[PDB]
Amino acid sequence: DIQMTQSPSSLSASVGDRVTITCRASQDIPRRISGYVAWYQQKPGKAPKLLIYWGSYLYSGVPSRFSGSGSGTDFTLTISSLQPEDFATYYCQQHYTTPPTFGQGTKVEIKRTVAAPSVFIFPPSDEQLKSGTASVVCLLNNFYPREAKVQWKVDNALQSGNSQESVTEQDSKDSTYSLSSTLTLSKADYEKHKVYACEVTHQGLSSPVTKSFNRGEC
Amino acid sequence: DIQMTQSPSSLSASVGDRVTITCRASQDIPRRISGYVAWYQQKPGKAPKLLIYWGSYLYSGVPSRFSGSGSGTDFTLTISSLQPEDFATYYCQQHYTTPPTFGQGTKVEIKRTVAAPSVFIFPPSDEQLKSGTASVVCLLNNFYPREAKVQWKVDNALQSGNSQESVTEQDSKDSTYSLSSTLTLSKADYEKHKVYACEVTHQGLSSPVTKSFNRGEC
Amino acid sequence: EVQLVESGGGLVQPGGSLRLSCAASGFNIKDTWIHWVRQAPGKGLEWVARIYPTNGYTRYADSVKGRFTISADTSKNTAYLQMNSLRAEDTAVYYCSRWGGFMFYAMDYWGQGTLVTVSSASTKGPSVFPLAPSSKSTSGGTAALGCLVKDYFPEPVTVSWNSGALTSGVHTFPAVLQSSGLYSLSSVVTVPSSSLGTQTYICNVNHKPSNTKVDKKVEPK
Amino acid sequence: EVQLVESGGGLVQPGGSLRLSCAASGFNIKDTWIHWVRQAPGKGLEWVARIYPTNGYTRYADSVKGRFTISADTSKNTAYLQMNSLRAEDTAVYYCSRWGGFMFYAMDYWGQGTLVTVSSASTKGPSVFPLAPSSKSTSGGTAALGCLVKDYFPEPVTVSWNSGALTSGVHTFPAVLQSSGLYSLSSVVTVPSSSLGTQTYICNVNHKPSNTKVDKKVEPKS
Known part of the structure; x- marks a missing residue:
């Protein structure tokens, strides 16, 4: 019709x-x-x-x-x-x-204009680990353009297929995006490894940025 | 369109x-x-x-x-x-x-149902005659069907072309019509003749009805 | 109590201008749509214009674009049809109407209509002559009387009998146009034959376009 | 103060029935027309039905004929969408709207919408875990912290910070559906590196479909 x-x-x-x-x-x-x-x-x-x-x-x-x-x-x-x-x-x-x-x-x-993300990595909570699962979160904050690449490594092992991404809608004031990447692992796998790293590639970054933590350090 | x-x-x-x-x-x-x-x-x-x-x-x-x-x-x-x-x-x-x-x-x-008209003739007024013109009116009242024939005679001369008719809209209660026929003459012509007659033929009448007056019978 | 009343109608020379008014009461035109519809003599209905007073949106029939303007004044609760460059073929009864509620596409209330006659002919009031039976006429008990309302222009005329007290058996005929270019009609009434020369019968004629009113007592001569 | 408020939306099993309500204020539905419009997740707008409450005239989109009925109760100033024989494809946010004045064909006021999820999966409230700030994690000149709102169904959840006192720099991410068939999201906020271990940060999570509310304090881990 x-x-x-x-x-x-x-x-x-x-x-x-x-x-x-x-x-x-x-x-x-x-x-x-x-x-x-x-x-x-x-x-x-x-x-x-x-x-x-x-x-x-x-x-x-x-x-x-x-x-x-x-x-x-x-x-x-x-x-x-x-x-x-x-x-x-x-x-x-x-x-x-x-x-x-x-x-x-x-x-x-x-x-x-191009704006590079600020990048943060968050370890799993002790509270969550009790449940049997660990979530590791990488935050890319207030960037432009929307396209960005996140790579996860665990003791230098590239994680493929066990993460999910979410992107905010464009900000109505500053025209930026933010993005989360969440890596899921079992407690037993988390506790077997030390170095957790998120590497971010984006147009506003002259080279990729890596944020990492070592499990059990502060 | x-x-x-x-x-x-x-x-x-x-x-x-x-x-x-x-x-x-x-x-x-x-x-x-x-x-x-x-x-x-x-x-x-x-x-x-x-x-x-x-x-x-x-x-x-x-x-x-x-x-x-x-x-x-x-x-x-x-x-x-x-x-x-x-x-x-x-x-x-x-x-x-x-x-x-x-x-x-x-x-x-x-x-x-068929309803025959009641018929009335009206002479011209002396007031109008003064102005130079004589209108003679014939009324057919409360009849059905609408079709009717009115013929005017003046000293038995059939009048053709010097009359006009008007018919009311169908009555919303009794479903009849009424009709007027008006004959126009000069005052000179009216004053030359005596018998003014309207003859009405209608489905409701077995034979035509004629109403007349004589000028100056007043 | 919802009502619409047209005014402003009458005789206008070709090329001339007239403004019609539609006065609303019992509702606010700001809450609705106002339309004009016209009807040429003897013809069907023709849509003319519409307005949504709130925002001034208008639409027109092709036949009137560039010549007529529909408008409204919400402070007077009145709508207007400004008609310019009038033509013979704009001769008609003009009705205003509305939509009600939010019931689009249904003209629920209408005015009574106002006649616009576009002509070079001038206004003229009627002469009113009695219609009474001759002195020698006989009857079977019912007699007719009337008034001949002759030689007027434009339409309309109204006729009552005994100031509105006599309505039974009245027929006011449609006007006919004479070869002179003037209208004439008759109004008649049937009454008891016995009442002739006893009861008073007066026809009350009003031809508003010429401001002509006549009250004529009708009796046999 | 013209307002329309939808209620009655939520999770229902395929083949189930749900009644949505649209409560009007600041105007009378008797004076106008009420419509329903829906929007499947990530899709465009779809017109569903309309009613003229005064005489009960209704029209329907072909996609819902014989299953959904639009109605109204002028005494309650409320319109209804009774939805029977529900299907997965009926999953959407449902909006009610009106026309105003006598301005046909223009939806001038809309409700906020109500989500209808058609699924055999059951309601489940989230677990809420801290995304802890650290003085050793600064980027772009600030710290960041948040709450991970994990393993809920159906949508939606709302998250506020410090009971609405904290709005600047907050991003609550769109939920993602996990391979488990449960949703998860994070809400994060950037704050001064000076505020840590001294300013209280509390995320307020409400998952109405499961009647689950959680207030989670998020602080630097010791």
């Missing part, structure tokens, strides 16, 4: 730039049928917020830097001067049909 | 009959686009009244004999048991488009 095609599906742009997102009906629609296209903004963990309704009307309290326009079967959202708080996924919505439908979304990322 | 095709354009039916009226979109419409079809009733001299909205919802205070239905791009209004007060023009309305559009309308007349 009728759908909206959104493009691009993602972009990055600098503070102060002009961004345009497009939404296109999937087929021909009889003339004079209104779609009353709306645009919403969604930040992490939050409900969508209304930006634009009926094609071009700015919703109350929305900054004037957002505008919408439409011609025929094509609608545009325009952010005239991109701000760090505008990191979000933007969705159009069409009301030709009942039910109405949403575009698939456009993820907007703020480009900023 | 998209239009609604209403049929029939007119009908007559008896008190108690089931009547159905139909409204058809002019084209194919993409699936899932709703037209929220509404139906209105309009009596003479009055604004339209809402009967049905969103296809099938009965508007508050409307009698339950009115109902609407839809399937695809065909819509129906149904009056279950026609009452004399239902004489009106019915219109459908579509909201696929903006602007929305109306059906061209269906005129519903009430079929009732």
Whole structure:
């Protein structure tokens, strides 16, 4: 049936730039049928917020830097001067049909200057070790761009397949990311080895950074 | 553009009959686009009244004999048991488009038993004659069916081309019509003749009824 | 108590301007949508415009774009149709209406309508002449009387009988246009023959476009 | 003070039933239209249903017809989404929203959402372990510390620090699903190397689905 095609599906742009997102009906629609296209903004963990309704009307309290326009079967959202708080996924919505439908979304990322991560390693707690399991955590804090590589070694043995990573959404004020890497080992394996190391590679680092601890030292 | 095709354009039916009226979109419409079809009733001299909205919802205070239905791009209004007060023009309305559009309308007349007219003739007033003109009026009162024939004679001269007729809308309680026929003469012409007669032929009369006066019999 | 009342209608020369008003009571137009619909004489309904007073969004029919403007004043709870560059074919009864609640696409309340006639012809009030039977006419007990309301322009005229106290058996005929380009109609009523020369019968005629009102006592000559 | 608040969401077994509530304040649902919209984890928005409480008119997305019913109780100013015959694919955050004024086709106010997780797996609260600061672990000019919130199900958990007094420099990571089928996350915070062993840091963890709340003091190991 009728759908909206959104493009691009993602972009990055600098503070102060002009961004345009497009939404296109999937087929021909009889003339004079209104779609009353709306645009919403969604930040992490939050409900969508209304930006634009009926094609071009700015919703109350929305900054004037957002505008919408439409011609025929094509609608545009325009952010005239991109701000760090505008990191979000933007969705159009069409009301030709009942039910109405949403575009698939456009993820907007703020480009900023390179920032190297601060790196911390945390040993497992004595409390956890009682349970039979040890978690070793490596934190990369407040960096840009998002791409980073973490390598774990245990007494110089490269750990492969027993870690998981998590990355924060882009910060709405400083446009950075942070990342955790968690290595899981049995208590018995942990207690068999001494040197635990996380090595971080990232564009802001001229060489990889290694943080390590020796089990049973302080 | 998209239009609604209403049929029939007119009908007559008896008190108690089931009547159905139909409204058809002019084209194919993409699936899932709703037209929220509404139906209105309009009596003479009055604004339209809402009967049905969103296809099938009965508007508050409307009698339950009115109902609407839809399937695809065909819509129906149904009056279950026609009452004399239902004489009106019915219109459908579509909201696929903006602007929305109306059906061209269906005129519903009430079929009732034959009723012959009562007939009256009126001479011109001396007040009008002063101004140079004489209007002679013939009234046919409370008759059914609407069709009737009025013939004017002036000293047995058939008058052709110098009269006009008006017919009332169907009565909302007794389902009859009344009709006037007005003959215009100059004052010079009126003053030259004596016998002024109106002859009425109607289904309800076994033979024609003639009403007359003689000028100056006053 | 929800109601809409149109005003501002009447005769206008072609090319001329008129502003119609739609005064709302029993609700706030700020809470809803106001529409204009028109009806040419003898014809069907035609959608004209709509507004959402809250943000001034308007839409128009193709037939009136660039000529008519719909607007509203929420402080007067009134909507307006400014009509410019009027044409003969804009002749119609203009109704305003609303949507209620959040019930979109259903015109639930309408005004009574106001007639706009676009013509180069000038306003003229009627002459009113009695319709009474001749002195020598006979009846079977029911007699008719009436008033001939002759030679007016534009529509409409209204007629009552005995200031509204006589309504049974009244027929006020649709006007006909004469070859002169003026309208004429008759209003008649049937009454007991016995009451002729006893009961008073007065037709009350009002032609608002010319500010012409007449009260005519009708009796046989 | 226009507000919508969803409740009633949580873990349910496939084929099970759940009723969501959307409680409105600052306006009457009788005056408008109420919608439900859902969002599967990491996916886009999907419209589910709408109702016009005044006359009971409802519409539904094909994906939920015959299983879900939208309803409303104007006396309670509350709308409902009864969800029957639930499936894994119905896992999502469910948002209620409205239209305002007579401004059709614009969802102006939304609830915060409620997560519905359709799974045969059972609820389990987390264990909370310290990620201890050390004066010998400084980077970018600060120390860091945190809480490892391990082995819970379903989502979500919330973490605050010092009962909401500490917000600057906090990162609570998105949960990751372990091979065990349980979630885990860390919440960390950067702080001054001078504050250690003198400032109290407490992470406040709440896993509502299991009624599990923990306050964990995190300090330098001795």
